[PDB]
């Protein structure tokens, strides 16, 4: 059978940095045409294994999920760099990862006068462990004064919105980005399409 492999790109909202819209299929049929259905790419290059030979690369997990990032910062999606999205929001595993695809969404997710539905988190505590959720949205205490459900000089909101005025230039755009994993390390395997 087939899988909703990249028809998920035909969706309204890719949540925020919090929820990754994790799909995590196990068995379907999918091939390179499902990747190549959509033309405009920004960061189609991938660090793990070159996409010129992605055919017959059958690995019994996808771990594939997507979100939205500002257009100023795209390069931090790479493994192991400095960046608030990649040190505080979500940091990629640095050993071996499947692929990444980036594209603009100025047409679809940039609304005039701002669209405050989107958001990104901020600094917390120690370094973010790679590939983990931080769905807690409670107010941040910097220290000492335990605070009480307010905002002040110590009570700090862990939330901040993109805004995304479409009048901004190449710096600020909705960039929809997806990441995938291709590892097997086990007994079973997924579909080997070209055969």
């Amino acid at each position, epitope marked *: 059978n087939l899988c909703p492999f990249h028809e998920v790109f035909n969706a309204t909202t890719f949540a925020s940095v919090y929820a990754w819209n994790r799909k995590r299929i196990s068995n379907c049929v999918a091939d390179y045409s499902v990747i190549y259905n959509f033309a405009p790419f920004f960061a189609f290059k991938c660090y793990g294994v070159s996409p010129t030979k992605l055919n017959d690369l059958c690995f019994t997990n996808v771990y594939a999920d997507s979100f939205v990032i500002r257009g100023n910062e795209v390069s931090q999606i790479a493994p192991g760099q400095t960046g608030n999205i990649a040190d505080y929001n979500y940091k990629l595993p640095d050993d071996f990862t499947g692929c990444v695809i980036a594209w603009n969404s*100025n*047409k679809l997710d940039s609304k005039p*006068s*701002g669209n405050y539905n989107y958001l990104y988190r901020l600094f917390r505590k120690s370094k973010l462990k790679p590939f983990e959720r931080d769905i807690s949205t409670e107010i941040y205490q910097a220290g000492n004064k335990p605070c009480n459900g307010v905002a002040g000089s110590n009570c700090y909101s862990p939330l901040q919105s993109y805004g995304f005025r479409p*009048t901004y*230039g190449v710096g600020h755009q909705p960039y929809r980005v997806v990441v995938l994993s291709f590892e097997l390390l086990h007994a079973p395997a997924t579909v080997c399409g070209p055969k």
Partner: antibody, heavy 122, light 105 residues
Framework: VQLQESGPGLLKPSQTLSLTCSVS??????????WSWIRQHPGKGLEWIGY???????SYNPSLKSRVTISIDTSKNQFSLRLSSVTAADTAVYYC???????????????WGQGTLVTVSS | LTQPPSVSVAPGKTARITCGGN??????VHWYQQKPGQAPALVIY???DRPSGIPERFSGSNSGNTATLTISRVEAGDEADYYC???????????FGTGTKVTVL
């Protein structure tokens, strides 16, 4: 930074075709000043129909959304309206407008052309 | 989205024009000046300041669910219709009042 408008003089009271034409002169149809059209029945107030920016993101009025298109171009720094199938529902003058300086959470329409009055159903 | 449709005043006597609507203190306002025979122009934006080319006689005010422009001195030049504009941030559209006409002798 001003604007100038032109259009059709006098046509029959029932057809489909309707044209506008705009030129800036003092500005460019590039960014930060979206282009919008305004309608009003004579003897009645204003009614917004549509605003358009350069990099797609097209939008129109919820009313009469069925047959409305806008064509922009920077070969002549122009933009124009395309309303089809008019049946004398509303004849108007259809001024041009821009948003000007974008702010926090508000927009106002500036600057405007002279406006081109057209007859009933063009 | 309401206002009175017309008003009359003596020349040189200060005049109030009013525009109603629920919770319009939350949102801003921009108002326009229509004399029949030409295009309108902006006279007050953000309820507090006017663009270049407009004297101090126009000073908008916002009081909760009401907005009001004050007309200190009155002549035939400003003898015109005045429109209401409200910008929406929810469905992201313009919206308009139907205007209000002033009348002198």
């Amino acid at each position: 930074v001003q604007l100038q408008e032109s259009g059709p003089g006098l046509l029959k009271p029932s057809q489909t075709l309707s044209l506008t034409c705009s030129v800036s002169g003092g500005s460019v149809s590039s960014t930060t000043y979206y282009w919008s059209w305004i309608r009003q029945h004579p003897g009645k107030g204003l009614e917004w129909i549509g605003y358009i920016l350069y990099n797609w993101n097209s939008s129109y009025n919820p009313s009469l959304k069925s047959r409305v298109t806008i064509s922009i171009d920077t070969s002549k720094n122009q933009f124009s309206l395309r309303l089809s199938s008019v049946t004398a529902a509303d004849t108007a003058v259809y001024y041009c407008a821009g948003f000007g300086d974008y702010g926090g959470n508000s927009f106002w329409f500036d600057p405007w052309g002279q406006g081109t009055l057209v007859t009933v159903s063009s | 989205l309401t206002q009175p449709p017309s008003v009359s005043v003596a020349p040189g006597k200060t005049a109030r024009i009013t525009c109603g609507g629920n919770n319009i203190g939350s949102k801003s306002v921009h108002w326009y000046q229509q004399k029949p025979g030409q295009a309108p122009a902006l006279v007050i934006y953000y309820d507090s300041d006017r663009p270049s080319g407009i004297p101090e006689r126009f000073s908008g005010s916002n009081s909760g669910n009401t907005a009001t422009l004050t007309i200190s001195r009155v002549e035939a030049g400003d003898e015109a219709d005045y429109y209401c504009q409200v910008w929406d941030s929810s469905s992201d559209h313009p919206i308009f009042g139907t205007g209000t006409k002033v009348t002198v002798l």
